[PDB]
């Protein structure tokens, strides 16, 4: 997986209005504290579609501003994770509903975690 042809034209710029990014090149130790790190900072991450089975993920800021100021400062550096670097890009999509799935149940404990903590859940 290298690229699944994001907005056509004539050059590769990063530049979209949207909210939701899409990473590529991720760690093999990829978590959701660093995805979502990855536009904790520039904004507020809403939503994650982990991805682990080809090392991707995804970020639903809570405004455009935010998703434009990740991938448009990001463009010019390298965010590595894990030590290792990572792929920067505004996703195709514009509405993240991760729902039922492998690769969401792993992600709301991050959402939730940052926002507050309780624990105590007995199994």
């Given at each position: 997986?290298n690229?699944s042809?994001?907005?056509?034209?004539?050059?590769?710029?990063?530049?979209?209005?949207?909210?939701?990014?899409?990473?590529?090149?991720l760690?093999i130790?990829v978590?959701?504290?660093?995805?979502?790190s990855?536009?904790?900072?520039?904004?507020?991450v809403?939503?994650?579609?982990?991805?682990?089975g080809?090392?991707?993920?995804?970020i639903?800021?809570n405004t455009?501003?935010?998703?434009?100021?990740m991938?448009?400062?990001?463009t010019?550096?390298?965010p590595?994770?894990?030590?290792?670097?990572?792929?920067?890009?505004?996703?195709?999509?514009?509405?993240?509903k991760?729902?039922?799935?492998?690769?969401?149940a792993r992600?709301?404990a991050?959402?939730?975690?940052?926002?507050?903590?309780?624990?105590?859940?007995?199994?």
């Amino acid at each position: 997986g290298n690229d699944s042809k994001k907005f056509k034209g004539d050059s590769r710029s990063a530049g979209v209005p949207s909210r939701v990014i899409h990473i590529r090149k991720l760690p093999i130790d990829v978590t959701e504290g660093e995805v979502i790190s990855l536009g904790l900072p520039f904004g507020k991450v809403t939503n994650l579609l982990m991805l682990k089975g080809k090392n991707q993920a995804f970020i639903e800021m809570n405004t455009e501003e935010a998703a434009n100021t990740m991938v448009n400062y990001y463009t010019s550096v390298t965010p590595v994770l894990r030590g290792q670097p990572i792929y920067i890009q505004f996703s195709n999509h514009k509405e993240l509903k991760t729902d039922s799935s492998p690769n969401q149940a792993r992600a709301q404990a991050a959402l939730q975690a940052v926002n507050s903590v309780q624990s105590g859940n007995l199994a």
